[PDB]
Design a protein around this ligand. Structure first.
Ligand SMILES: [Cl-]
Ligand SMILES: [Cl-]
Ligand code: NA
Lengths: 253, 251, 257, 256
């Protein structure tokens, strides 16, 4: 099943979509600069692009680390990105009360991995009718994603994306199970599946590339990143696009 | 470091405290009845006891499933338990705004494992000044518990309990690492460590298993245990025998 | 570092080599038939090929379970394969005393995963001077592979291939860490690394799975692929499967590191 | 099911048996000296004791690490340990042809974890009729131990001990699943189960150090009611006092 996000088609048999941007929204000028760079590079390569950032980082390394600009300013910055570049945007939500005001600006809203089984948040997100990105917790198997999907469906929303972020592997390490993509496709109605390569990785550039190419080889709707340096983005995306283009060009069976 | 909860001393070198009760609060009468049974059994064995229940089930089977009595009715039930039995109580909280009104009634407030890194909830719980039970997520190593402890300390609360619930082991399965208890004691200032044997097993009759696992964990020297046939009694008799032996040996 | 196996160049930046064949040697006719099919398919696709089979099942669930042809009969079958097709062959060895007579016939000899730390077998394999395929145990991390490599080097043999077969993941399940390939390459002198996709899946239709997993691994830039098929992928699907692996391998190998 | 090893009863309901000694046999005098220390400490505490060592250690971390005095001298040293102290002994075998001559002298023979599914070794060990200690591989679940047991039974030997060593847990680390003991007991006819605490720990890093760890882990395993404790290469006495306290408590109580 494909999902339309403005003029983008997102789907497991469609050209990959890049979801990228910054960690925490901290100012208008810096956000617009970064977004501009992603926009120019993805336009040059013909890669569909959705800008990502958090306005309210709920899990901070220390209490008093800056959470971001907050809801009211964060949504203004997202409106300005949409106005200036004409692209969709994505951001996470942490409380039921945030769902409506965030959904009425942001094209995709995201269920954080830690909150993925919090029924009240699922229902509130569902009721927006927006496109939803579900972050797979690292302790949840791919066959348990169906239960989360089922709850969204019960609440009346089937515009769901599944986002792989790796699985707990002993202490501290994560491993990405390349077979979990297919399990999620088979058990969840072939909803779009995207791969968060960044938060799957605890030099690092050779690693992120190897992992991103391996996951995209399995036929995915998109790639989700934060840890990549901005100027090397083009070389990186050239390689992902080469592989995606090859894979998607071949029939499934 | 010991923590006093009314007349109970909770600590890794003190007689173990049992934290037990029911999953979700459903009614006053059922709750009082269940509590009464725990109270009678723990009193006759001489085991300190804290009653546990949730007022709200945050992860439901269907969007349509009983959520439990809710905050307002849940707190009235807890007030009734405290009045009738004179024991401390423990419950979990899911949102920052709930922390203050819950902490007015409940002796121990509990940080759910899924929410253990949600900074706002941590701060709001810390600011109550109450005793806090931190549920260790199954994807977090024991050496990371110090980072949660550090946050509570910055927010001005050091009355923390660490609660082992098992570690992810492949898909849909847990294992308890018996060495994690000592790692948490060493790296977190010897705060009380308790063992949630029940959640540690939900992925695996089951009575032999819970006993084996509880005895094994309590052999490592812990502050507490978190969970016609008299099954609770027979179980606690054996835990207390081991706990008493282990606590009588020098460190 | 590349390794030459007759006319084949095996290396992490060379076109991938297929190591394939059957699980256990059962009959001479059935072996020649299966091999003939692998040979015809790989030749048409321009994929270098090494024929694989075991002459003995060492590890079966029952003491009476069928174990195969045995050493003496197995080596006569391997000689026949080499004579008829002119290709290299690969087989596993289980005891030190077998290494020399097996190495006299088989181009590549294979250290089973369960025996990978058995020092007497390592030393006897190393002393043959043959190319060795090391099966990475499922309990060994990729950074510990260097310790096995070090032992072969200590015993005077550096013609070593590292073969990924998946990692233990809870009870009775495996996961393939796509990053372990690059860890092996960096820590083991960039020796050829190959992927045994088949054993990596035996704990999990299955054709879609093997393809996804094989593609994902080969995306990381590997010297080869190691698999089984039965009359295990069905033998008839081999061509379509390899067409896809080769398309990806060719794309990946054409990009610079 | 209990197993008699001379005058020792090994069983999940019997006082625990200690299996310990040295890593590799090097010389008669040094072996006797070490064994004499284990013997004096275990006699003083009333703990049954089986001396362990390798004569040809086949899995050492270097190819030139000493494997031991070898089969002929190793067995002579074992005979002397038996004659001098009157205790049973245990050693590991890695090749089929070694099983018979080893079993002439060593009371218990041990199947290395890595070789546990190697059918030819299993059969050759079974055929000795001796007591066998099966080391559980770290990549094998406790419910797969029944398949190893079945093969020994098929080959005509039921005097089997199951030895826990931990399970793979991510890369490098091992974790001991305290529920695996009960699974092995339920599925394998309640054969004796012993715990190799040492192996279970060597992958683990660093007020306590490794001694506090080995003690915590040993006590946790013995709390599940086990036939014995198995150690690898004044502290032994203090350690055994604490294990014995717990073992005595646990074994004094009925199962159910
Ligand atoms: Cl994110
Ligand atoms: Cl193989
Ligand atoms: Na919207």
């Amino acid at each position: 099943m494909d999902i339309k996000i403005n003029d983008i088609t997102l789907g497991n048999n469609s050209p990959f979509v890049l979801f990228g941007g910054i960690n925490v929204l901290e100012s208008l000028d810096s956000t617009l600069q970064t977004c501009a760079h992603y926009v120019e590079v993805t336009r040059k390569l013909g890669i569909p692009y959705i800008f990502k950032a958090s306005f309210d980082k709920a899990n901070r390394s220390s209490i008093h680390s800056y959470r971001g600009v907050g809801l009211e300013e964060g949504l203004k910055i997202f409106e300005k990105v949409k106005a200036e570049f004409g692209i969709p945007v994505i951001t996470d939500v942490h409380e039921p009360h945030q769902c409506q005001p965030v959904a009425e600006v942001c094209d995709v809203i995201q269920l954080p991995a830690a909150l993925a089984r919090q029924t009240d948040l699922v229902v509130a997100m569902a009721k927006t009718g927006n496109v939803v990105n579900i972050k797979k917790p690292q302790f949840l198997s791919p066959s348990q994603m169906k239960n989360i999907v089922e709850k969204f469906h019960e609440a009346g929303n089937g515009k769901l994306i599944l986002c792989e972020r790796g699985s707990s592997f002993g202490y501290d390490n994560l491993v990405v199970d390349m077979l979990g993509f297919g399990v999620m496709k088979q058990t969840c109605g072939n909803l779009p599946v995207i791969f968060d390569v960044t938060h799957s990785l605890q030099g690092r550039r050779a690693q992120a590339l190897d992992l991103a190419l391996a996951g995209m080889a399995t036929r995915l709707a998109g790639l989700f990143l934060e840890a990549l340096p901005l100027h090397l983005l083009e070389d990186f995306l050239i390689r992902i696009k080469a592989l995606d283009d090859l894979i998607k060009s071949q029939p499934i069976l």
